[PDB]
Amino acid sequence: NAALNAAQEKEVRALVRDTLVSNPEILEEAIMALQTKKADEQQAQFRQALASEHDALYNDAASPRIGAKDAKLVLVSFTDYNCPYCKRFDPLLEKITEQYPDVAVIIKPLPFKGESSAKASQAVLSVWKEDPKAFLALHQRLMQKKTMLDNASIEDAMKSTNTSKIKLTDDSLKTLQNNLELSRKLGIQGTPATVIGDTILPGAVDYDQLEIIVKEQLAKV
Template sequence: MKSTLLTLTLLGTLLTPALHAAPFTPEQESRIKELIRETLVANPKILDEVADAWEKQNAADQASQLGNFIKGNQDVLFNSATSPRLGAKNPKLTLVSFTDYNCPFCKQFDPHLARLLKAYPNDIGLVIKLLPFKGQTSAKAAQYSLTLWQQDPARFLALHDKLMSKQGMLTEADINKALAATGNTALKPEARATEELRNSLRIGTLLGVQGTPATLIGNQLVSGAIPYEELEQIVKAELARKG
């Protein structure tokens, strides 16, 4: 299918007359098609080379678009006071984690992020954007943790870890137990937490996040619970790029 599309694209390019030039005659068009067919039959690797070049150019275009979007949305991505922030105070590199308390892969991946912050205490910062994709308890847990962040940031991490470490889907009872275990039984969700969730969903959608976990590292959006070693390699490369 890819080869067919590329052939059609090539044909279309060749069959389009240059600006101000006379159009091809039917005989010329027929001969061009024959030449293309003969060339491809004699050199079938051409299609692979064209496909590779197209894929590289497409990837470069997407990276450029992502970079421009990130540059135009620095404040909401990296500097929002209502988004939890962990790690170095003046980091060389700030990651943005799109995550969900009911996502099993997020529960697997969250310890990798914690390990990374410990390994690079002066270099790495982490902004957490909660995306409650998986049910009402996901949203409720997020509202509690975000409210706590906005009221008392120093106490956020204990509740966050408690909610994230609970295996399986959270129940109302699980959330209440987490609140009790971290001394937050009197905590009441605030409207600012709901607004933060809306903003996270909006920026995540515009950024192209299609599921959790997703981690923004430099100008690269990394999807899924990748192994720690792979995560660290990406981070090291980005730190080296920043110098």
């Protein structure tokens, strides 16, 4: 009919244009607010993915654990054996469980860096299931290696750790693919990726820096 007269309405239209164009900053405020909306959405979306797969993260038997089982705070460490930052990052992660009895870590091998991360992983898993107590040695050694993994040096590490006896089961591939499906469900794109409390860290971190985070979650009880 209508609620504004023709003239008024037309002027409104003109006012839109003029407002945004003569004052750009309003567009920036709108951008920022759309950004802030999308961020917040994702963050909540992660927080749900994370909260849903509690039982594959924390309660998988096939997944290797470092430190006590009862340990109040259990971290989760997505590592690739071929990833150079993981090799640098892992020792710390280990150090905390020795320093902090209440802390433990869980290992999730990922095959993205190469064929050998896959075979390596598979080995470590086979070991884990066939003999848990043994695992740490082989894990450690494989991480200690700087050079890229081949099928022999896997034998060589396995041998140098007295685990060469163990056959790579096929059951251990499921675990790999599961760590793989899992890393997708959490929208994890890279490695090392560490789960702590309700927070995830996709890179490597200084020790002192790490200690404050783990203490901060210790305080969360």
